[PDB]
C-alpha cells in the first residue's frame, strides 16, 4: 500500500521573543516538490574503535521549506521569532514541534524560505 509520499498540511505559530506576542497557527504551502526532513533522536553517535560508540547529547533538527506568508514579516522566518511547527503527510503521519528556534539563517528572496528549526524533541503519531 503506502499511499503517495507528500505533505498535506503545514502549521506554524510565531511568538516574538521580545514582546511575547503570538501569531498563528497559520498554514503554509510547499514551494516545490521537495519535502521537509527530520531527525528525532536527541543522541548522536560517534564511531569509536572495535565496534564501540560514544553516545553524546544533541538536538533534534528539522529542515522545512515554505512560501512566505505576505502578512508575517520576513524577520519572523529568519530567526527573530520562536516558532512551533506541525507537518502532516498523506499516509497519516504527523510531526509536531514546540519551542523551536530558527538556527543558521540562510539568505532568501522574499517568497520562499528554508528554515532550519532546532528543538528539544520532535513527536510523531505514526498513522493508525
Amino acid at each position: 500500500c503506502n499511499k503517495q509520499n507528500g505533505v498535506k498540511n503545514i502549521l506554524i505559530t510565531f511568538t516574538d521573543c521580545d514582546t511575547q506576542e503570538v501569531i498563528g497557527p497559520i498554514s503554509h504551502e510547499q514551494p516545490d516538490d521537495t519535502l521537509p526532513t527530520y531527525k528525532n533522536c536527541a543522541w548522536t553517535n560517534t564511531a569509536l574503535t572495535n565496534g564501540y560508540v560514544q553516545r553524546s547529547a544533541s538536538n533534534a533538527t528539522m529542515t522545512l521549506p515554505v512560501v512566505r506568508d505576505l502578512r508575517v514579516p520576513l524577520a519572523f522566518y529568519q530567526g527573530c521569532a520562536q516558532v512551533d511547527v506541525q507537518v502532516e503527510k498523506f499516509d497519516g503521519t504527523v510531526m509536531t514541534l514546540t519551542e523551536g528556534a530558527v538556527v543558521e539563517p540562510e539568505e532568501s528572496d522574499g517568497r520562499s524560505v528554508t528554515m532550519n528549526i532546532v528543538a528539544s524533541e520532535i513527536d510523531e503519531l505514526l498513522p493508525p
Binding site: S27, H28, R71, Q86, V94, M95, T96, L125
Partner: protein, 373 residues
C-alpha cells in the same frame, strides 16, 4: 527632610501583606449564641481579631480555628462556615447554595456525624467531576472509637482523609483534625507533591500532648487499618497520609489515588491542562476534507491529538509517571461529524486521559546479617 517632592512614598507598617495569599481553607463547625455572625453563610476571617465575638466563647469552631491559626501563620486565607446549633447534632445539606463558585481547596469539618461527613464528601465529589470553573481540593475529617467502629465507619470515599483516633485518645478530636488539615494546606500551596508524613514534616506543632508510655492503636490494629486507608497519628506526628480510597468500581486493588499527594498533583495537572487547552479557542476545525488553506488559522482533529500528545510527553516526570502506552491513554473523542452545517455551535471535544501519580519511596525493609571472620 528629603522625600518632600514625591518620587518616593514611605509607608512604614509593622503589619503588611505582600504574599499574594492563597490556598483557601474552609473550616466548619458548631457556634454558640454570643457569636455575632450570620449562621449558614461562608464568612471570611481576616485574623485573630474576632476570637469569640463572631464565633462564640466555647464554640468548637472557635477552638478548632484557634488551633488552625496556631499550626501555621502564612499565605492561607482562612474562611469559615459557622453552622448553627441543633444531643442531635445538626445535619446540613444546604452546601450547594451556601458554598457557591468560590473554590475552597482544603475543607476541615469538626464533627463525628457520619451523615455530615458523607454530605461534605458528596459536595467535594460533585465539585470534582462536574461543576464549572473546575474547583479542587481534598477534605480532612476525623473518626474516633474502637477498631471495629473506625474500621467499619469508612467507605471507599476518596475525597476525604479520615484521621483515626483510639477510644482512649486523650485529646479533643477537633483540635488534632483541624491542626492536620491546616498544616497540610499551609504546606501544599506552592508545591503539592510534598508528602506530609513522618516526623520532620508532619509533626503537628500545637498539640502538646501529655507524654505517656502507652499508645492507643497498637502495632496490630495499626497494620490493620493501614491496608484500610486511614491517617493514624502516633507533639504527635502524622504518617501514612493517605485517603480513604481502596477500590475502583469493583476491581479492589488500586493505588492511583491513595496518597493525598496524588490527589493534589491531579488537581495541579487539571488546572495546567485547562490553561493549556485554552489556546484551542476561536479557530477552525476542518474535519471532512482536511486541507487547511494557506493563510487561515485552522486545525483538524489529528493535529489536535498530536499537540495533546506532545504536551503530555513533555510534562512527563513531575506531574505524572511515564505512560505505558501513550496512544491508548490519550484520546480526543470528538463529535464534530454529528454537528450539521445548519447550525454553528462548536465545542464538544472532550478529552479523557489516564493517571498514575509519580512513584515514590516507601518501606525499604532491610535484613542485616551480622557475622565474623
Amino acid at each position: 527632610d528629603a522625600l518632600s517632592d514625591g518620587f518616593v512614598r514611605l509607608c512604614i507598617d509593622p503589619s503588611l501583606n505582600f504574599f499574594g495569599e492563597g490556598c483557601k481553607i474552609l473550616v466548619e463547625g458548631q457556634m454558640t449564641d454570643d457569636g455575632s455572625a450570620t449562621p449558614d453563610a461562608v464568612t471570611c476571617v481576616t485574623s485573630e481579631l474576632d476570637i469569640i465575638e463572631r464565633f462564640g466563647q466555647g464554640s468548637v469552631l472557635t477552638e478548632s480555628l484557634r488551633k488552625v491559626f496556631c499550626t501555621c501563620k502564612s499565605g492561607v486565607s482562612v474562611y469559615a462556615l459557622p453552622r448553627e446549633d441543633a444531643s442531635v447534632n445538626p445535619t446540613p445539606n444546604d452546601y450547594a447554595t451556601v458554598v457557591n463558585e468560590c473554590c475552597f481547596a482544603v475543607y476541615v469539618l469538626s464533627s463525628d456525624d457520619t451523615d455530615w461527613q458523607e454530605n461534605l464528601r458528596d459536595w467535594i465529589r460533585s465539585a470534582w467531576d462536574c461543576s464549572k470553573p473546575q474547583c479542587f481540593g481534598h477534605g480532612y475529617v476525623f473518626n474516633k472509637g474502637t477498631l471495629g467502629q473506625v474500621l467499619a465507619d469508612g467507605d471507599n470515599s476518596a475525597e476525604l482523609s479520615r484521621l483515626a483516633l483510639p477510644t482512649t485518645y486523650p485529646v479533643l478530636p477537633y483540635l488534632t483534625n483541624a491542626a492536620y488539615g491546616a498544616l497540610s494546606a499551609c504546606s501544599t500551596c506552592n508545591n503539592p507533591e510534598l508528602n506530609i508524613q513522618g516526623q520532620t514534616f508532619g509533626l503537628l506543632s500545637c498539640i502538646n500532648m501529655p507524654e505517656s508510655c502507652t499508645p492507643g492503636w497498637t502495632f496490630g490494629e495499626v497494620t490493620q487499618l493501614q491496608a484500610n486507608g486511614f491517617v493514624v497519628s502516633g507533639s504527635p506526628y502524622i504518617y501514612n497520609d493517605v485517603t480513604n480510597y481502596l477500590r475502583d468500581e469493583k476491581n479492589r486493588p488500586n493505588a492511583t489515588f491513595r496518597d493525598a499527594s496524588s490527589r493534589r498533583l491531579a488537581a495541579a495537572t487539571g488546572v495546567a491542562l485547562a490553561e493549556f487547552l485554552q489556546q484551542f479557542n476561536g479557530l477552525a476545525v476542518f474535519t471532512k476534507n482536511t486541507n487547511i488553506r494557506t493563510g487561515i488559522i485552522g486545525t483538524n482533529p489529528r493535529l489536535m491529538l498530536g499537540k495533546i500528545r506532545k504536551w503530555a510527553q513533555d510534562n512527563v516526570g513531575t506531574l505524572f509517571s511515564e505512560f505505558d502506552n501513550i496512544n491508548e491513554d490519550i484520546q480526543l473523542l470528538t463529535d464534530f461529524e454529528v454537528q450539521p452545517k445548519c447550525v454553528g455551535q462548536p465545542g464538544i471535544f472532550h478529552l479523557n486521559m489516564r493517571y498514575r501519580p509519580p512513584v515514590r519511596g516507601a518501606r525499604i525493609n532491610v535484613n542485616m546479617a551480622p557475622a565474623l571472620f
